[PDB]
């Protein structure tokens, strides 16, 4: 099972079957055969395996990283503090990449699920994708194969200088 | 092949996915934007005076 | 849901089982082709169930089962797509390849490598089903390259024959130009839309989508053998008849049309790509039918026929009717494969004679193949209420009553008349008249495999168009209000072609001799396209390879500039240095000159 | 990294104290054991590299190259033991000793944290290969090939030594972990232009660049089979590793100083593939194919984007495996017919069917059939170069067409057609040759299932 | 498919074809009767005979071997050698 | 042109080759049997009209203009036999024509499946290696000084010995292996 | 009359339309006899080496070795730098390099100038 808030999904609404004709549809008979011959033995085997798994129980944990000071409060050419800040920045870079992956998966799921009316019913997913892609592009794009926290700090400083000049010339 | 198949979370990809799930849930619950345009806080950055 | 995806994935796994069965085998397999045929029949049933589910409800799904790779933001997973196209194409392909493998059990019976032949056929089918069920462009490219490589391995089946090797390499070359187009489209999609999965491509919906559409058009030109990259399809007749009947008739060559069908949300908002596709399709269908009018090899006639039909498919793609194009794919597969099978039967009964000038009198000698050939040619020409009527006439009706290029419509109609002409040319020269084959007669068609395969494809070519066209859901608005002359255009054009070619054959029967014209030599010699291109382009490329790159640059000049000149300079300096005469007087004179130069000219004492 | 160095130097008393008939068995067995042991380097982290000591470290770029080297050594031991059958025992032990020494230098090269130690090992690799080529090569011009190879490498690499010492004196350290945090922009001047040339020309020669590639169709041809395998599979990748490590110090001057070599290597692969189309020698054809693929890697490194770097390292590993297998197949043909001419022995599929299957698989991986890692690397480099500029897709498509053309020309010429009438010494394939082919093929096919371990340090 | 051949069948078929020729009296020819001398035929008659036998047996005899086929026994022996009969 | 036993093509050979090519191409243009018979008789009459011509230059000019006439009126693609060069099944079975020297590399385990065949192979090889020196001695004394003039080989003059250079043209593979 | 067959580089004149084929003079007969003698002598050598029962190897062909040595190891000894060689080398060596350099430099300059003004649509571009 997963968390239904990070991966949302609307409630399923299926119509009732109305046999207008008198011809028996083979799909109901095939579903009966599938439940008799396939679903029952697989369910029994999984029950046995889960019983074997419940005899001994051990846990694995999600690794927690405490926050260290970032590169903005590191002295220049101070390898210890800069090393810790660089490792933290790389971890957040990986997490941001997977956040963009999550939003992309949401968008693809909406496009497949809504059917032919996807252009109207997937407006919110498109807006979320556009916003998160704009944030990712403003944060991490055009850094090169040798990206580091200093490059990202320089890019953010240049963008902030451009924004300050733009708001000065528009004042 | 058996050793490569069961490598213990090579380059932290699965951990990154789990942490991204946690962060997306936390930011979506409180109405926060999922990602900001600036990696570092503008408050702790001194722009050059011009 | 738990039956749909299970049955689709088990159809694919069932198809891939006999490859592992033959790879892990030690002794000689006990009737391995029968095992492959039984496997394919079971897979056809197993894939036939989910299409019934889709016909009942409309259930389309996407199964992204195995996560493969994550390249930064991009995520590649083993994703399969069960939609309208996959469910309407997989059982048709499985049915046709079932009939083809029974015909191969009859046909390649005396081949000492029949197991390798059936393994190659199954590999091609596996790669094609990877292609048609693909979700992202990477899996689509995997299927693309797989069917290309299997085409290379199957065309050159008799590898001791040089012409098979030339045909296979030529097919590879044209498909690699198509690969250039595919690579450009995939690169544009990744760079501009940050995805390879089709759902995100359709969701983002670019407006300035000219460049990826031209990439896809080039790829479909390469794969489906449109004009410019056509001649590999008629050159591919060097392989065995079942290879032609499956790949180069019904399954492999429709991959470009299928690729352009899948991207119909992109092409439906672009008039430029639609006009390009319409013009290219009309050019292809008329040029290939005109080439087919005066051919003498029966397999070359059918190859030109299926290239003309693919041009018609490109036309009906270009008039914004992609579901009609897919319906025509599913229609055309049946009767084209069975026409190839009957031509192979005629070839086998006359000791590997593929010339229609050495046939005739086979109307009563081989009655079942005659019946099947007549039914297939009538279904191909567009006889009413056969399988071809339910797709081809709707294509012509939509082409007439649309905002269309005038010239493209004109050459489409002329190509339809030409299809009628060469169909009755085949029927006249291969069945009617007096025998022209050699004296000893070993004519036989009484094998259960050949009869059963032809019978199954005959029932398909009789009723499958009706069943499919009545079972598919309406994905567009059918145009059914038109003037009388536009409604009767296809039938009148086919009837006119039949009358013209009947008169042509009757005039052929006369006792008169005429010198050939330039039109006859233009049509018979394939429009001079292969004779010019295959002699000119390899000449230029290979001469540039040897006279410029291999000899002039790296064997002459790149060797001259850096190493040889430096070596000669050091040799000359060494010969000047060491050429002293061994006299103390000259050495001491040099010492005095050195002292004087250092003291006066260089000022080393300051 | 001492847990791999010490068994490698302990291979030397193993080959110098074995019996007269058990040297191959012992050396192959223990090298395979160390190759199995080399998998412990896969303890890589998403943020930090695996730093062992002050002198040694191994990130996710050097790890595939290390595993490739330590796996390649027993393949060369299995390949080189048929043509050294009648050799003196002391010369046989000397040959195995040079192979062991080359593997030791190679595994000390990829893990060197200091740049000058990397340089010292990278130029210590010259002596065993030169000795192998010029001593156990079969032809007259092996001496000329050794001279060309040695002098191209040294003329390219002496300014690299001067520039590295200058960087040490100016920055204060050549430690790669320090230089990641102490790096400075390199401005536009003539001094920095010649700094870039001095730091880059050694690895441009070793890769090789088009125009500096004249030593390759000699050293790759007059070498023995083990020499050709280690030259194609590992030694060309020292240049790639060097440019990946050294580009960090050369910014932002790379963005305009990389233009002439990008034009040399984009046009160069077309020229080398066209040369491959009209080659009468099989070994020379494989060498020129290596030149084309390394030109692709040069372009990928020079445009310096993440996709290009991942494609470059994947393409490096894939081309190493494929070129080694192709050289082994050509060597088997040479042992059968005693000539390197491609037109002499034809139609070998009717005589050697499983070898023809191995030939087909090697040719298919040469033309980047998906989903092989060859195609993964080539595709990623193509995507990144398309992002660089759009006409690069025209150049890449032309290169792919000619690559498929010459690979299938190789296959059709050697294996298909009518067999040669007067050649009647075509023995059946030994178990040793088939085992060598399968040990080249099966890792290459298995790596398509988990391709994430060959995608560099920024996967 | 492909029924086998024998010298008796080859000789019978070649004599059948040569017997249906109007320029040869059927009561005079035999297995070793010459064409120019024993039957009085031109070179064009020999060429047409060779083309008729090619059409009968379905395979082509090259000209450099067709000029030397001068009696029915040599035609039989040539066909027997080219098709590898009595194995 | 290219002949093994002759250095040239005679005039009569050129006329006969032209006659055969013209009749084959006329059959290609005239696919029906009766029509081909009629036009073949017309062509035969045309060829017989100039049969008795003793002028060599006039016969040469007639041959040249006949070749020009044939080249103007040839079929774009004539009928080629399936096994003839350029045919559809030409050199098709070359992949199955394994030479006979590959049987010497068979393992003894699979050589035991055919004992009598391999005994016959052994006595055939014994005969070949016994007759080789005799046949090369026969060939040595029959070649004139200065090399052979044509490519024709002599037969065996006396009794007991086989014709010289016989092995690879007797043990050639069958047409359908 | 009939249209004369004009030969081209890629379509040779047929042997039945060559006026020099019908030559009957004794010099051409002597030449053809000499060529047949050379061919027959070489064929005799090959067949003597070919039908030897005691041979198991490769009948070496000096013509093939001659061809490979001419194709590979003679080009630089028989190369003289003159106007033609230098002109062709400058045309085929530095021509395409300069052409592609100017093409790529112009394209990248245009793209980099459009990017910095914000005129180039880069909305979803985060892969590079
Ligand atoms: C690595 C750098 C150096 C390179 C050279 C190395 C040389 C030395 C070699 C040492 C040993 C080999 C090392 C690499 C091993 C790579 C393989 C590996 O371990 O993969 C792990 C991968 C791991 O997969 P995974 O990552 O998805 O698994 C999830 C992880 N666990 C297991 C923990 C839950 O293994 C597999 O993918 C195996 C999957 C099951 C088996 C395959 C099933 C499908 C097979 C095909 C079916 C038919 C399809 C259609 C066919 C049609 C006809 C063609
Ligand atoms: C022959 C007899 C064998 C034994 C028979 C008896 C047992 C049979 C098995 C019974 C069920 C066992 C449990 C279920 C199976 C395992 C479930 C599981 O968690 O699996 C782990 C995972 C599931 O994926 P995942 O999402 O959990 O993890 C993926 C792994 N990482 C994250 C590292 C990428 O892997 C597999 O299932 C591997 C098998 C996949 C099967 C198909 C392989 C195709 C190979 C194609 C290669 C090339 C692809 C190119 C294209 C790619 C796309 C663009
Ligand atoms: C394989 C064949 C091709 C090989 C090509 C090798 C590279 C080509 C260029 C090499 C230049 C020489 C090394 C330069 C190292 C620069 C380090 C440095 O600090 O530079 C900044 C320094 C700057 O001086 P500085 O650093 O002392 O001063 C402080 C800085 N300023 C100037 C601001 C005050 O550059 C130099 O000192 C001079 C650099 C140019 C040297 C020109 C002479 C050599 C010409 C090329 C020779 C190439 C090989 C020829 C032989 C081939 C075989 C026969
Ligand atoms: C919608 C857009 C449509 C655009 C259409 C116009 C553009 C494309 C134009 C056509 C280009 C390809 C066709 C020309 C080359 C074909 C080569 C070939 O396969 O020739 C076949 C020939 C053997 O066949 P054949 O001679 O017919 O045999 C009869 C019996 N002997 O085989 C041979 O002779 C073997 C030759 C081997 C070496 C070939 C060297 C030439 C390769 C050229 C590649 C060009 C790639 C261009 C890519 C551009 C990308 C931007
Ligand atoms: C479908 C409708 C079929 C019936 C109406 C059309 C008939 C037709 O087109 O006839 C033309 C012609 C037969 O007429 P004709 O050639 O004059 O007579 C032959 C000697 N009995 O030729 C034919 O009838 C043969 C071609 C008929 C093609 C019909 C399907 C397209
Ligand atoms: C890109 C790099 C370009 C330069 C690479 C180095 C030079 C070229 C490769 C080495 C020399 C190649 C060679 O063998 O040249 C042959 C030539 C004459 O050799 P010779 O002694 O006559 O022959 C022995 C019997 N055959 O040998 C000679 O004439 C001797 C040349 C010696 C050059 C040594 C390198 C000097 C570099 C620095 C120069 C300052
Ligand atoms: C031969 C075998 C095959 C090929 C193998 C590789 C050979 C080529 C390797 C070296 C290529 C040349 C060096 C790289 C040049 C890149 C472009 C560049 O920066 O050119 C310099 C200069 C550009 O002009 P500008 O920008 O004004 O320069 C002021 C800089 N402070 O440019 C100019 O002003 C024009 C040129 C002036 C002279 C330059 C001499 C030094 C560089 C070559 C050494």
UniProtKB/TrEMBL annotation, chain A:
<feature type="compositionally biased region" description="Basic and acidic residues">
    <location>
        <begin position="1"/>
        <end position="12"/>
    </location>
</feature>
<dbReference type="Pfam" id="PF10249">
    <property type="entry name" value="NDUFB10"/>
</dbReference>
<comment type="similarity">
    <text>Belongs to the complex I NDUFB10 subunit family.</text>
</comment>
<dbReference type="GO" id="GO:0005743">
    <property type="term" value="C:mitochondrial inner membrane"/>
</dbReference>
<keyword id="KW-0999">Mitochondrion inner membrane</keyword>
<feature type="disulfide bond">
    <location>
        <begin position="110"/>
        <end position="122"/>
    </location>
</feature>
<keyword id="KW-0496">Mitochondrion</keyword>
<feature type="region of interest" description="Disordered">
    <location>
        <begin position="1"/>
        <end position="24"/>
    </location>
</feature>
<dbReference type="GO" id="GO:0045271">
    <property type="term" value="C:respiratory chain complex I"/>
</dbReference>
<dbReference type="InterPro" id="IPR039993">
    <property type="entry name" value="NDUFB10"/>
</dbReference>
<keyword id="KW-0472">Membrane</keyword>
<keyword id="KW-0249">Electron transport</keyword>
<keyword id="KW-0813">Transport</keyword>
<keyword id="KW-0679">Respiratory chain</keyword>
<protein>
    <recommendedName>
        <fullName>NADH dehydrogenase [ubiquinone] 1 beta subcomplex subunit 10</fullName>
    </recommendedName>
</protein>
<dbReference type="InterPro" id="IPR019377">
    <property type="entry name" value="NADH_UbQ_OxRdtase_su10"/>
</dbReference>
<comment type="function">
    <text>Accessory subunit that is involved in the functional assembly of the mitochondrial respiratory chain complex I. Complex I has an NADH dehydrogenase activity with ubiquinone as an immediate electron acceptor and mediates the transfer of electrons from NADH to the respiratory chain.</text>
</comment>
């Amino acid at each position: 099972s997963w968390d239904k808030d990070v991966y949302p999904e609307p409630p399923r609404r299926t119509p009732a079957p109305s046999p207008q004709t008198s011809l028996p549809n083979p799909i109901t008979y095939l579903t009966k055969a599938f439940d008799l011959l396939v679903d029952r033995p697989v369910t029994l085997v999984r029950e046995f395996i889960e019983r074997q798994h419940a005899k001994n129980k051990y846990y694995y944990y999600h690794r927690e990283f405490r926050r260290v000071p970032d590169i903005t409060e590191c002295h220049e050419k101070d390898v210890l503090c800069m090393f810790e800040a660089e490792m933290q920045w790389k971890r957040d870079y990986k997490v941001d990449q997977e956040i963009v992956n999550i939003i992309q998966e949401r968008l693809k799921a909406c496009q497949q699920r809504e059917g032919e009316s996807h252009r109207q019913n997937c407006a919110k997913e498109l807006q979320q994708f556009t916003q998160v892609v704009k944030a990712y592009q403003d944060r991490y794009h055009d850094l090169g194969a040798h990206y580091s926290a200093r490059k990202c700090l320089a890019k953010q400083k240049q963008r902030m200088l451009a924004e300050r000049k733009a708001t000065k010339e528009a004042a | 092949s058996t050793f490569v198949a069961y490598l213990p979370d090579y380059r932290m990809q699965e951990w990154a996915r789990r942490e991204a799930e946690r962060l997306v849930k936390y930011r979506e619950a409180h109405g926060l934007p999922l990602m900001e345009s600036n990696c570092f806080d503008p408050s702790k950055i001194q722009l050059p005076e011009d | 849901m738990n039956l749909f995806s299970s049955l689709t994935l088990v159809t694919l796994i069932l198809l891939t089982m006999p490859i592992a069965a033959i790879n892990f085998n030690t002794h000689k397999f006990t009737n391995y082709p029968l095992y492959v045929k039984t496997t394919i029949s079971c897979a056809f049933i197993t894939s036939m169930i989910p299409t019934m589910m889709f016909i009942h409800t409309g259930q389309e799904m996407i199964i992204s089962n195995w996560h493969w790779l994550t390249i930064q933001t991009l995520k590649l997973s083993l994703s399969f797509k069960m939609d309208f196209f996959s469910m309407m194409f997989v059982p048709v392909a499985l049915f046709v390849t079932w009939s083809i493998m029974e015909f191969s059990m009859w046909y390649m019976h005396s081949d000492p490598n029949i197991n390798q032949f059936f393994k190659y056929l199954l590999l091609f089918l596996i790669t094609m089903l990877i292609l048609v069920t693909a979700n992202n462009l990477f899996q689509l490219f995997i299927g693309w390259e797989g069917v290309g490589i299997m085409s290379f391995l199957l065309i050159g089946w008799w590898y001791g024959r040089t012409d098979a090797n030339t045909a296979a390499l030529q097919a590879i070359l044209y498909n690699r130009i198509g690969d250039i187009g595919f690579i450009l489209a995939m690169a544009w999609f990744l760079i501009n839309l940050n995805t390879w999965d089709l759902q995100q491509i359709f969701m983002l919906n670019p407006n300035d989508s000219n460049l990826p559409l031209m990439g896809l058009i080039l790829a479909a030109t390469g794969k489906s053998a449109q004009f410019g990259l056509h001649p590999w399809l008629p050159s591919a007749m060097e392989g065995p008849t079942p290879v032609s009947a499956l790949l180069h008739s019904s399954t492999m060559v429709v991959a470009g049309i299928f690729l352009l069908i899948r991207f119909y949300p992109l092409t439906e908002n672009n008039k430029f790509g639609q006009s390009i596709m319409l013009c290219l399709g009309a050019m292809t269908t008329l040029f290939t039918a005109m080439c087919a009018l005066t051919q003498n090899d029966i397999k070359k006639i059918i190859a030109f026929s299926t290239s003309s039909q693919l041009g018609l498919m490109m036309v009906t793609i270009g008039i914004n009717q992609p579901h009609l194009a897919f319906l025509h794919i599913c229609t055309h597969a049946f009767f084209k494969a069975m026409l190839f099978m009957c031509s192979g039967s005629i070839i086998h009964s006359l000791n590997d004679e593929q010339d229609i000038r050495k046939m005739g009198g086979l109307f009563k000698a081989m009655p079942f193949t005659t019946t099947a050939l007549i039914i297939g040619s009538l279904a191909l020409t567009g006889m009413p209420f056969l399988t071809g009527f339910y797709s081809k006439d709707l294509i012509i009706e939509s082409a007439n009553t649309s905002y269309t290029n005038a010239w493209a419509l004109l050459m489409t109609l002329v190509a339809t008349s030409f299809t009628a002409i060469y169909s009755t040319r085949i029927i006249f020269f291969a069945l009617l008249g007096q025998p022209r084959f050699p004296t000893l007669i070993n004519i036989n068609e009484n094998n259960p495999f050949l009869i059963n395969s032809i019978k199954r494809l005959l029932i398909g070519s009789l009723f499958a168009g009706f069943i499919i066209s009545n079972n598919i859901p309406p994905m567009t608005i059918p145009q059914m209000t038109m003037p009388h002359y536009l409604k009767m255009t296809a039938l009148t054009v086919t009837i006119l072609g039949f009358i013209l070619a009947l008169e042509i054959s009757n005039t052929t029967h006369y006792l008169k001799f005429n010198y050939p014209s330039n039109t006859f030599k233009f049509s018979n010699l394939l429009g001079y396209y292969p004779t010019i291109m295959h002699r000119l382009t390899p000449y230029m490329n290979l001469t540039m390879s040897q006279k410029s790159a291999s000899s002039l640059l790296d064997l002459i000049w790149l060797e001259t500039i850096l190493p040889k000149t430096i070596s000669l300079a050091q040799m000359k300096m060494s010969t000047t240095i060491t050429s002293q005469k061994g006299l103390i007087k000259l050495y001491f004179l040099s010492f005095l000159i050195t002292i004087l130069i250092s003291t006066t000219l260089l000022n080393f004492h300051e | 990294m001492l847990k791999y160095i010490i068994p490698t130097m302990m291979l030397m008393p193993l080959t110098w104290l074995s019996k007269n008939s058990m040297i191959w068995i012992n050396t192959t067995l223990h090298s395979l054991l160390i190759s199995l042991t080399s998998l412990l380097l896969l303890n890589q982290f998403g943020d930090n590299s695996l730093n062992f000591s002050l002198t040694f470290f191994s990130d996710s770029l050097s790890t595939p190259l290390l595993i490739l080297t330590m796996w390649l050594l027993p393949l060369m031991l299995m390949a080189s033991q048929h043509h050294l059958s009648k050799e003196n025992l002391a010369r046989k032990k000397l040959f195995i000793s040079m192979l062991i020494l080359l593997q030791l230098f190679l595994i000390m090269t990829f893990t060197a944290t200091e740049l000058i130690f990397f340089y010292i090992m990278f130029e210590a690799t010259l002596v065993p290969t030169l000795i192998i080529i010029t001593r156990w090569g079969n032809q007259t011009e092996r001496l000329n090939a050794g001279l060309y190879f040695l002098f191209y490498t040294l003329a390219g690499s002496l300014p690299l030594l001067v520039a590295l010492i200058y960087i040490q004196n100016t920055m204060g350290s050549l430690n790669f972990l320090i230089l990641q945090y102490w790096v400075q922009p390199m401005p536009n001047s003539w001094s920095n232009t010649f700094m870039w040339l001095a730091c880059m020309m050694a690895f441009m020669v070793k890769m090789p660049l088009y125009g500096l590639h004249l030593w390759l169709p000699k050293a790759h041809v007059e070498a023995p089979i083990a020499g050709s395998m280690v030259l194609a599979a590992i030694l060309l990748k020292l240049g790639g590793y060097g440019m990946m490590r050294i580009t960090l110090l050369l910014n932002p001057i790379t963005d305009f100083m990389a233009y002439p070599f990008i034009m040399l290597s984009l046009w160069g692969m077309i020229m080398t593939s066209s040369i491959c189309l009209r080659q009468t020698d099989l070994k020379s054809l494989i060498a020129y194919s290596s030149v084309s693929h390394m030109a692709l890697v040069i372009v990928a490194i020079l445009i310096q984007t993440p996709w290009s770097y991942m494609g470059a390292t994947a393409l490096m590993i894939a081309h190493g495996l494929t070129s080694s297998m192709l050289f082994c197949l050509a060597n088997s043909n040479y042992e059968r017919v005693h000539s390197r001419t491609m037109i002499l022995a034809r139609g070998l599929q009717t005589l050697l069917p499983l070898m023809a299957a191995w030939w087909l698989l090697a040719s298919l991986t040469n033309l980047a059939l998906p989903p092989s890692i060859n195609l993964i690397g080539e595709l990623f480099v193509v995507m990144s170069t398309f992002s660089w500029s759009n006409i690069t897709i025209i150049l890449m498509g032309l290169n792919m067409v000619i690559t498929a053309l010459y690979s299938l020309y190789m296959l059709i010429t050697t294996q298909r057609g009518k067999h040669t009438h007067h050649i009647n010494n075509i023995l059946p394939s030994f178990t040793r040759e088939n085992a060598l082919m399968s040990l080249h093929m099966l890792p290459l096919l298995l790596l398509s299932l988990n391709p994430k371990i060959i995608l560099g340090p920024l996967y | 498919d492909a029924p086998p051949l024998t010298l008796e069948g080859i000789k019978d078929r070649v004599l059948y074809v040569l017997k249906l020729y109007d320029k040869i009296d059927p009561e005079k020819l035999s297995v070793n009767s010459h064409f120019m001398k024993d039957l009085g035929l031109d070179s064009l008659d020999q060429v047409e005979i060779i083309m008729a036998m090619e059409d009968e047996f379905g395979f082509e005899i090259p000209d450099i071997d067709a000029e030397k086929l001068m009696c029915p026994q040599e035609i039989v022996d040539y066909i027997a050698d080219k098709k590898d009969v009595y194995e | 042109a290219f002949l093994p036993s002759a250095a040239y093509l005679t005039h009569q050979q050129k006329v006969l080759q032209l006659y055969k090519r013209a009749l084959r191409h006329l059959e290609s243009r005239c696919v029906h049997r009766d029509k081909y018979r009629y036009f073949a008789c017309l062509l035969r009459a045309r060829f017989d009209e100039h049969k008795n011509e003793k002028d060599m230059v006039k016969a040469t000019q007639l041959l040249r203009e006949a070749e020009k006439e044939f080249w103007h009126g040839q079929h774009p693609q004539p009928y080629i036999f399936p096994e003839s060069p350029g045919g559809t099944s030409y050199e098709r079975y070359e992949c199955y024509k394994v030479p006979e020297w590959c049987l010497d590399d068979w393992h003894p385990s699979e050589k035991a499946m055919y004992p009598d065949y391999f005994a016959k192979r052994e006595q055939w090889k014994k005969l070949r290696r016994e007759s080789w020196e005799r046949e090369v001695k026969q060939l040595q004394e029959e070649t004139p000084v200065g090399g052979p003039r044509t490519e024709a080989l002599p037969p065996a003059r006396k009794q007991g010995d086989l014709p010289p250079l016989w092995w690879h043209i007797v043990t050639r593979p069958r047409e359908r292996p | 009359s009939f249209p004369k067959y004009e030969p081209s580089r890629l379509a040779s004149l047929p042997t039945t339309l060559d006026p020099a084929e019908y030559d009957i003079s004794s010099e051409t007969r002597k030449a053809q006899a000499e060529r047949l003698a050379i061919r027959s002598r070489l064929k005799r050598e090959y067949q003597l080496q070919y039908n030897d029962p005691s041979r198991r190897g490769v009948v070496e062909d000096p013509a093939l070795i001659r061809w490979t040595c001419a194709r590979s190891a003679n080009v630089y000894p028989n190369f003289r730098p003159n106007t033609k060689t230098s002109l062709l080398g400058a045309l085929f060596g530095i021509g395409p390099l300069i052409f592609w350099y100017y093409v790529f430099k112009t394209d990248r300059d245009r793209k980099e100038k459009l990017i910095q003004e914000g005129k180039l649509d880069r909305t979803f571009n985060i892969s590079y």
